[PDB]
Symmetry: D2
Subunit: 274 residues, 4 copies
Amino acid sequence: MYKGIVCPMITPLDAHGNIDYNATNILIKYLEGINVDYLFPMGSTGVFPYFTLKERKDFLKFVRENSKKPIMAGVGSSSINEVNELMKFSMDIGIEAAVLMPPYYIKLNQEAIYHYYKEILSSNDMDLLIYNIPQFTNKIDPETVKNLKSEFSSVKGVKDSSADIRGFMEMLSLSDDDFAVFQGQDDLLFTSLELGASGGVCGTTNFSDGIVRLYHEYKNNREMALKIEKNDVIPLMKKLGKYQFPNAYYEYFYKKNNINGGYRPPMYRVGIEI
Amino acid sequence: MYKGIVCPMITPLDAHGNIDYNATNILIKYLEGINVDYLFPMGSTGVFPYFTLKERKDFLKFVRENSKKPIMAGVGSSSINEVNELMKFSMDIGIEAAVLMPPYYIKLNQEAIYHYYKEILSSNDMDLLIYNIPQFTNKIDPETVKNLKSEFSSVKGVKDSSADIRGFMEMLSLSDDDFAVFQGQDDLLFTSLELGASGGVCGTTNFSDGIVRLYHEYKNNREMALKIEKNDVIPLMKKLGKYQFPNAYYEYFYKKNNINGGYRPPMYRVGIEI
Amino acid sequence: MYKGIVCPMITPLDAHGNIDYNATNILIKYLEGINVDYLFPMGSTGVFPYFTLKERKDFLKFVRENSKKPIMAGVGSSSINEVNELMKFSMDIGIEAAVLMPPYYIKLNQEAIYHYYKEILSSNDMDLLIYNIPQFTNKIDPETVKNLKSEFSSVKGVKDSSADIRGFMEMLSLSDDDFAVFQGQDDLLFTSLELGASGGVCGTTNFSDGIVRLYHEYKNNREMALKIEKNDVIPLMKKLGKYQFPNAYYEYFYKKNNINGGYRPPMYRVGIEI
Amino acid sequence: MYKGIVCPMITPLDAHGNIDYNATNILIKYLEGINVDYLFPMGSTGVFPYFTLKERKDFLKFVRENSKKPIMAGVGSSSINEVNELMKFSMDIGIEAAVLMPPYYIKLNQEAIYHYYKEILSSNDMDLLIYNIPQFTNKIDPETVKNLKSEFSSVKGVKDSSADIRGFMEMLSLSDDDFAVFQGQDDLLFTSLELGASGGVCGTTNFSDGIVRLYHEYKNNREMALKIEKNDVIPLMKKLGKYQFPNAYYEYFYKKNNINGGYRPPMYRVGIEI
């Protein structure tokens, strides 16, 4: 079962906008500390498309050689060659699963998205999680997920960051013992678990245990989970949302740890407070 | 310095969906034949994000070596490291101009987009054209274009594929001797020349010469130019627009030249008639 | 204190698309039978803007005169004059509450919307529930509702059909003992109750008791309410949503009571399988 | 035979937000005194849906009785009874043409919109121009305009405010000797006339002759006319667009004629200079 809590890791940067591996190690330590169940390097929160194929390869290598935690590697790209390359390399260095969103830039219908996933999943074998994030890329309909699910046992779940609860409940309908469904919006996790979500992919866990507390409080303590959602998580999200995504996550991390972290353009420091 | 007709080149593919350097030749001599003024490899029509940095570097090298008409290289990428490397390569091999659209995937405000163009232009000399294509990426406001223009003399103009006439007229206000303004929708070229456009970047020129005949006819025969727009270009855009962009553009160039051309996912064959 | 199940009544029509007051009675007696708590004539479901001011006054009278259920009168209109008239009229015939959404057609910011509710609330003491349905009219921000809340005690709640769960939780943050928050989408009722909603405004109650069982079951058997939602309401809501709103609701009502009912253009007969 | 410049009259108000028939006469005279070709009362600029059926009737009667200019009556309403009533009324008192945009509030597909126009054009006889304004209501496709045109000889043309040049060109393709096509955006008049537009419906003519000068200078000196579009109409439209539509057109009329005019909420004074 894929389930529990995934941290879409930031990619901590030094002051020249390059990968800070000491800070990455600091982050991994913190995540192990609060007991996330998976590491998710090079997601949206880790801003994978600002990095080169090389840097992403380098960063994936480091994260696996510095934690024994199971890793869902972000293998996103609009180039099928980059996705396959990144997937082979993740498989060849012991990363447990891949995370993939639809290709972006050019707007696509479902047949186009379907064909792309088909090619990738027949060229591959590792556990893949489909990732619907229609704010940054073409949407993948639940039906398209369903059909990809049928043809490929390699597909082990879907992650949804839509914030569309109706869309989410469609994805949930695809849930069974070998298909997880993850909520990618921290403030919607509690509600999602009630609807039977496998868990959440939550970026606040880069610097707060709130989401993990909520989740290990859930099975026993409904109202406590909700309290932690309503009082700690939602306000934190509301504060992060005032800012151009994702630079406030970086600043929060840099401050909580007293690091001189930097920003690769188009990132910039936004001036958030704790 | 910058004026006339630009071909946003298709990037011909073999049946495996990898670059067809022979069709590229067929295509180059076709574009020299009908007399487009500039070659623009790796734009949206060339589906640049589907290729790796390597592939895109090779294709730029090849177009350079195989033609004498001036080149605008598409150096687009949400990764700043990739843009700089693509502009450096382009300069060093004698490509006249770089084309650059705002970063994509993550939604960006105007300060982020500006911080990005600024860090890039601060470390580069070559003639650069800004590219507003808000359908596929974050929009860049005319004012942002203006502010960049004052700060960097190497910005040589701006291209707009928005099809928003009011917006286009705003971009036109920035026009002067050292700042061209190009229309990126073939069907609007006529309306745009009448408002003071330096010209068009028109994908139809990959297998048709309507847009060129239109442009040279324009100077002392407007209603001939309008006729060609109304009778030839606009219908051809109607047939093309029925299909997933840009696939019909490929299948059509393929039919015209009798090429066993292929499709790289998420591209797929559409079934257009010639 | 407002809470429980609100039926946003259809306005039954004869074969000539005029109000069928006999069917309206058939409906009122069905609503009483399944024990909804409030009748809401001339909401969106009741396609109120298709009717004249005179037809609307007349319908509120009929409903008020053929049921002792507490009534929330849809007093919607972009004309502040029609609202005052409709509210004055429904106060004078003993309708308990008014329901008002923001003005439509012309796009409005929050100052215009505020001033419009301001002028109106200053002239009508009666109980009013603000109605937020951004699909059909200008959205009213949570902040704007908060402001009006404190400035007029007459505002007794807010109804939200946006289907935006984050937005709904903002509205719920305004919840208290003299301020209700209703979920307007039937499939979202269970989630909304879990989060503290005062109840639902649910169109399916026009011909289905599903929503009402759900609300009453929720008290002692939580999982049972959820089952009703998933097997009954949600699958019904999917059927109804395959068609242009709200026509399917009308057919479904017509077929169930074997009534020969009609459709005032732009309404039209659809085909639902009941 | 429908051709030239139409004023979408404001409906001037007194300080209490009711119709000022003295100021309305001031307006009519002014419009006669810049030789606009038609008067269009109760279009969007006249904010027709903020008025009662009875006020609207009284206002059309007044404009009929107080000018020999041909009139196009705004007959807009989502209620088909109000449209039949306003149309029958306009023809009875000798208004030449009716103007009708699609019904609003509820989202309508094209079939709903068709059955609605069909019914109305089946029941009324007078000259009728279809009004496409997708910002404030459901869009009506060219194909739908087209079909109606063929079914009903009383459909005399179309007016379009979308600001979508491609879409407007599609509407122009339907043009013929008894099917006029008007450009609704003042700043887009020049571009629209080149493409063959019958004329323009222009709210800046409530208080400025710029559009009327433009249209008469055109036929005989295009470049004199485009200078007007650039130095007079467009900058005026820039200023007016700073504000919540259509309030600034009201303030502007009020200041020019020194009239103590008002605002019916949700209208409000916006504070605009000269």
